[PDB]
Amino acid sequence: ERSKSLPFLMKPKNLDGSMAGDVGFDPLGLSEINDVGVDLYWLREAELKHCRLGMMAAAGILFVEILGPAPGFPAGKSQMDVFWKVYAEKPSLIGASLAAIAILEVISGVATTQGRQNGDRAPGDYNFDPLGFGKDPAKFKDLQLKEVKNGRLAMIAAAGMILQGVSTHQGALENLS
Amino acid sequence: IVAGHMYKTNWFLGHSIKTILEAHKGPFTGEGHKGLYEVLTTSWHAQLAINLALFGSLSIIVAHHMYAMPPYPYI
Amino acid sequence: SKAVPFLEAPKALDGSLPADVGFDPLGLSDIGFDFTYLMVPTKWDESRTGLSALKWFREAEIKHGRFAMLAVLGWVAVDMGLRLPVAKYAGYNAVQAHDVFVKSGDMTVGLLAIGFLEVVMGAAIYEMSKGSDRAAGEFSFDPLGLGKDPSKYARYQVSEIKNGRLAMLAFGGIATQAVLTNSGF
Amino acid sequence: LDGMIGSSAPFKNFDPLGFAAKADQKTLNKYRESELKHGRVAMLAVLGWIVQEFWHPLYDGKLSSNPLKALTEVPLIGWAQIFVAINVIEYLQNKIKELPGYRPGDYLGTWEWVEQSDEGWDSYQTKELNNGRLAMVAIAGLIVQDLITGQAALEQITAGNT
Amino acid sequence: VSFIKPYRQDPFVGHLATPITTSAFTRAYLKVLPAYRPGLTPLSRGAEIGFTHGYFLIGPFYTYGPLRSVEFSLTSLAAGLLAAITLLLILTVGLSIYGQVTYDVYDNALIVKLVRQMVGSERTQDLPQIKGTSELDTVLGWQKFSEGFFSGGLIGSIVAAVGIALYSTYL
Numbered sequence: 017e018r019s020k021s022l023p024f025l026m027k028p029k030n031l032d033g034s035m036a037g038d039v040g041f042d043p044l045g046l047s048e049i050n051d052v053g054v055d056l057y058w059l060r061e062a063e064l065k066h067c068r069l070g071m072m073a074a075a076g077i078l079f080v081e082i083l084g085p086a087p088g089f090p091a092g093k094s095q096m097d098v099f100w101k102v103y104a105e106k107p108s109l110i111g112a113s114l115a116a117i118a119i120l121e122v123i124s125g126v127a128t129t130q131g132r133q134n135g136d137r138a139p140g141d142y143n144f145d146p147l148g149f150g151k152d153p154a155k156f157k158d159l160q161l162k163e164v165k166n167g168r169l170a171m172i173a174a175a176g177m178i179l180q181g182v183s184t185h186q187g188a189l190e191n192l193s
Numbered sequence: 194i195v196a197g198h199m200y201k202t203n204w205f206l207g208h209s210i211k212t213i214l215e216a217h218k219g220p221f222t223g224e225g226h227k228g229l230y231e232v233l234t235t236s237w238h239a240q241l242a243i244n245l246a247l248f249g250s251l252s253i254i255v256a257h258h259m260y261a262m263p264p265y266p267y268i
Numbered sequence: 269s270k271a272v273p274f275l276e277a278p279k280a281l282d283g284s285l286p287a288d289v290g291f292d293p294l295g296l297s298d299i300g301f302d303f304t305y306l307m308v309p310t311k312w313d314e315s316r317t318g319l320s321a322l323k324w325f326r327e328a329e330i331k332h333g334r335f336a337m338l339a340v341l342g343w344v345a346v347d348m349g350l351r352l353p354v355a356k357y358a359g360y361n362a363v364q365a366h367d368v369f370v371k372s373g374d375m376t377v378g379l380l381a382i383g384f385l386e387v388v389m390g391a392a393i394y395e396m397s398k399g400s401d402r403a404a405g406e407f408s409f410d411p412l413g414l415g416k417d418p419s420k421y422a423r424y425q426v427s428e429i430k431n432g433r434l435a436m437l438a439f440g441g442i443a444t445q446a447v448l449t450n451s452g453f
Numbered sequence: 454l455d456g457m458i459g460s461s462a463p464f465k466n467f468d469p470l471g472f473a474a475k476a477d478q479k480t481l482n483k484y485r486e487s488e489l490k491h492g493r494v495a496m497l498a499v500l501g502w503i504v505q506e507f508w509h510p511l512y513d514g515k516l517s518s519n520p521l522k523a524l525t526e527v528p529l530i531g532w533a534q535i536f537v538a539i540n541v542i543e544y545l546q547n548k549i550k551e552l553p554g555y556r557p558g559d560y561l562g563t564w565e566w567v568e569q570s571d572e573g574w575d576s577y578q579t580k581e582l583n584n585g586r587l588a589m590v591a592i593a594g595l596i597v598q599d600l601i602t603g604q605a606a607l608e609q610i611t612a613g614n615t
Numbered sequence: 616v617s618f619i620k621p622y623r624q625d626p627f628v629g630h631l632a633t634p635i636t637t638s639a640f641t642r643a644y645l646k647v648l649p650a651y652r653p654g655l656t657p658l659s660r661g662a663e664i665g666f667t668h669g670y671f672l673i674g675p676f677y678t679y680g681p682l683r684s685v686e687f688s689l690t691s692l693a694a695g696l697l698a699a700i701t702l703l704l705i706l707t708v709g710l711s712i713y714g715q716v717t718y719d720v721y722d723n724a725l726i727v728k729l730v731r732q733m734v735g736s737e738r739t740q741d742l743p744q745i746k747g748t749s750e751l752d753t754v755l756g757w758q759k760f761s762e763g764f765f766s767g768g769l770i771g772s773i774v775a776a777v778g779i780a781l782y783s784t785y786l
């Protein structure tokens with residue numbers, strides 16, 4: 017009856033055990049929202065998209081700062097400020113990436129709403145397993161848990177890197193030391 | 194934006210225009226505003242009357258404030 | 269009552285709460301306002317029966333006591349030295365460290381973190397108002413485990429509330445006096 | 454000190470000196486008439502005191518903003534007209550007092566419409582009475598302060614003579 | 616409570632009992648006016664009405680006439696007085712013709728009872744009908760009312776002229 021994460025709180029009604037990373041940590045009861053097209057399905061899809069985006073962004077920042085930029089690309093070690101140097105010399109790359117992300121996000125929203133309507137697609141599912149790393153069950157649950165935990169950690173990390181780069185105008189590991 | 198969070202729509206929060214109107218009675222006005230909510234939610238003509246009157250008054254106020262305080266450069 | 273004998277009792281200080289002696293001359297434990305509405309302004313839930321002002325006051329008193337105990341520990345620590353093993357914390361007492369650290373962008377971080385914890389535990393308070401069995405000040409935080417043996421739990425309860433009252437008054441004195449036992453006005 | 458209107462929460466049926474415990478209905482009606490007249494006159498007097506202090510458009514300015522000083526500056530032929538108007542009003546009130554069903558302070562004749570009074574009507578009458586009492590105390594304080602100090606309300610407050 | 620009700624418990628009259636039509640202030644104020652004050656003969660009502668009306672009528676004529684004067688002028692006062700008196704004469708002519716064409720009665724509050732009791736099988740409108748029971752609603756009553764209005768108008772206009780002269784001279 018009590019949430020596993022917060023023993024002083026009752027179990028959130030909509031979070032039983034199903035989703036990976038579920039420990040009952042919903043103090044504000046946001047999982048019970050059923051308005052403005054927002055429900056547990058939409059919240060989970062948003063959480064998974066945030067997890068994946070944060071993982072990609074943190075990996076990119078760390079890669080560029082440690083191993084350096086790719087040939088022909090600007091340096092500076094400040095990832096929040098090197099973006100304007102890339103846009104100053106290769107605006108077409110940024111524009112094409114933005115257009116591609118826009119199209120993919122329109123497709124993602126359509127897929128989310130459709131899967132919410134005629135329930136056949138789990139939240140965050142895009143059938144993207146080209147290498148077959150999660151075919152069999154009893155490993156899919158473990159992979160989902162790993163992805164969720166890594167994505168939450170990378171969300172926090174990427175938000176921290178964004179704020180550090182905006183404020184200190186220095187590199188992430190530069191702030192570290 | 195602040196004024197937009199006034200009327201109850203889908204949560205237990207905000208006002209009901211029916212309850213506001215029905216509470217505004219008086220010794221001189223009998224039942225007061227009881228039934229006005231039903232009038233303005235079932236008649237397009239009443240809404241058009243109110244909106245058009247206030248809209249024309251707003252247009253005249255705009256006309257006054259325009260020349261009174263010119264809001265555009267070199268106008 | 270057991271204190272201020274010429275006043276019988278407020279009305280609600282029956283004894284169901286720990287550390288109860290009956291001291292409430294102003295009868296503050298009888299206000300009909302459910303202070304959970306200071307958090308959730310509307311009834312929101314149809315199951316929100318309501319929270320008595322006495323239980324809200326007990327939660328507030330326990331929280332105040334814990335805050336004051338930690339506060340006097342910190343203020344006494346910075347009077348006798350004991351700076352964090354990092355730069356930018358040199359010596360600037362306690363009457364001036366607050367402002368200089370509010371300037372240096374970390375008191376805001378502390379505000380954010382404390383507010384996060386406060387929001388979670390206030391959600392706990394709101395669930396208590398909704399009708400959860402959780403008692404005031406009970407966050408089920410017993411990691412080391414010195415909370416079993418119900419007699420020990422009750423003794424530690426009364427101990428915590430009495431120590432919190434003492435620490436509230438002691439912090440009031442310390443901040444008002446600008447410390448006399450370990451520093452000067 | 455009866456089922457009369459005017460009993461509020463802080464002191465219900467406030468007759469500490471027992472003026473009403475021995476009086477008959479006629480004396481109590483007289484007391485209510487006096488209280489209501491004093492309250493209305495005092496509300497007018499307080500509002501006039503303040504407004505005159507910070508606004509005296511008439512008489513082409515002049516008429517020093519301090520009350521109890523403009524009292525001796527009005528042309529004294531405008532005093533006569535105000536006196537005559539008050540007198541005619543009170544003659545009309547006297548004529549009203551003999552109308553059937555008359556109530557002590559009721560010069561609007563609300564007894565014609567208000568049979569079986571509500572709680573809102575009683576509450577509004579009590580509101581008028583309490584505002585009148587507060588204005589009586591306020592105008593007494595205003596006159597006494599202006600007499601002893603010589604400064605008006607917003608002038609004494611502004612300087613800080615408190 | 617409600618402060619507007621049907622007049623005299625008749626929901627079909629073209630009237631309402633508002634806090635202005637049937638208020639105690641309205642009752643007393645209209646009952647102290649000369650037109651409705653009890654105990655006044657029609658001549659007395661006319662005299663008082665004429666006095667008040669001439670008194671306030673001389674004002675606009677003297678102040679804003681064709682012969683004004685920012686100072687006090689006897690010619691301006693005489694012009695205003697004559698204009699007020701002639702206006703009172705015109706009003707008295709109107710009153711006289713109105714009373715001539717309106718009523719045919721010499722003693723009211725009786726003829727109505729006589730025709731409600733002893734039958735009124737005549738040309739009607741004199742025996743029967745008869746609107747109003749006041750003494751002002753007779754040929755004799757209205758004639759004396761007009762006479763009083765005219766005399767009181769003259770007297771009040773003269774009194775107001777004297778007062779205006781005194782105010783302009785000694786003040």
Ligand code: CLA
Nearest residue numbers: 338339341342345346350351352357365369374375378381
């Ligand atoms: C009410 C509690 C409280 C508060 C507000 C402070 C505030 C402060 N202390 Mg401090 N301190 C306290 C208690 C407290 N102390 C106690 C009890 C001790 C002894 C253990 C110390 C020991 C101490 C040292 C040794 C030093 C300070 C210093 C400082 C100052 C720098 C920190 C800063 O800028 O904000 C940072 C942000 C915060 C302090 C907010 C606290 C947020 C915490 C970390 C969140 C987690 C709390 C924790 C998990 C509670 C567990 C309960 C529950 C979860 C079960 C600042 C004025 C330094 C200084 O220079 O002072 C002059 C310094 O060197 N303190």
Ligand code: CLA
Nearest residue numbers: 497498500501504505508509510511516517523524527542
């Ligand atoms: C007891 C009430 C009372 C008395 C005795 C006075 C006396 C005075 N006022 Mg005054 N005044 C009052 C109330 C009063 N005021 C109120 C309530 C207001 C607010 C509107 C004002 C606003 C006011 C201004 C703005 C000025 C004066 C001025 C003056 C002085 C010159 C007379 C004049 O022009 O009056 C003018 C009065 C008015 C314009 C408003 C009077 C409205 C009356 C009080 C309400 C209706 C009365 C009605 C006939 C009787 C009630 C009916 C029913 C209840 C029975 C004189 C000392 C003048 C002066 O020289 O100032 C120093 C001046 O310029 N007064």
Ligand SMILES: C/C(C=C=C1C(C)(C)C[C@H](O)C[C@@]1(C)O)=C/C=C/C(C)=C/C=C/C=C(C)/C=C/C=C(/C=C/[C@@]12O[C@]1(C)C[C@@H](O)CC2(C)C)CO
Nearest residue numbers: 095096097099100121122124125126127128129130178182
């Ligand atoms: C209606 C809708 C879409 C939809 C739908 C459909 C289509 C109807 C289908 C479904 O049926 C429903 C629904 C709702 O899904 C809405 C669209 C979504 C919006 C409104 C898009 C918002 C995206 C904004 C982002 C993601 C911007 C991020 C900015 C960054 C800045 C980066 C910086 O580097 C910059 C530039 C400067 C540097 O110095 C530092 C920083 C600041 C870090 C980080 O990235």
Ligand SMILES: CC(/C=C/C=C(C)/C=C/[C@@]12O[C@]1(C)C[C@@H](O)CC2(C)C)=C\C=C\C=C(C)\C=C\C=C(C)\C=C\[C@@]12O[C@]1(C)C[C@@H](O)CC2(C)C
Nearest residue numbers: 103104105106107108109110111112113114115116117119
């Ligand atoms: C949109 C796009 C790029 C957009 C870039 C933009 C907007 C950038 C604009 C800017 O930089 C400028 C200009 C100047 C700056 O100052 C301003 C900005 C704004 C910064 C590229 C698309 C690029 C699109 C590409 C490359 C598409 C390739 C498609 C292929 C190969 C299709 C193959 C198939 O069609 C067949 C053959 C058979 C079918 O049956 C099956 C399939 C497989 C679908």
Ligand SMILES: CC(/C=C/C=C(C)/C=C/[C@@]12O[C@]1(C)C[C@@H](O)CC2(C)C)=C\C=C\C=C(C)\C=C\C=C(C)\C=C\[C@@]12O[C@]1(C)C[C@@H](O)CC2(C)C
Nearest residue numbers: 291362363364365366367368436437439440441442443444
């Ligand atoms: C008055 C008070 C407590 C009074 C208690 C009383 C009377 C109790 C009386 C009783 O117990 C007895 C005696 C006996 C019992 O039988 C009866 C009662 C009746 C129960 C506490 C004040 C408490 C007052 C407090 C705590 C004030 C704290 C102020 C602080 C901390 C300021 C912090 C700063 O941040 C600023 C604002 C600015 C920065 O620049 C500088 C610093 C200094 C850092």
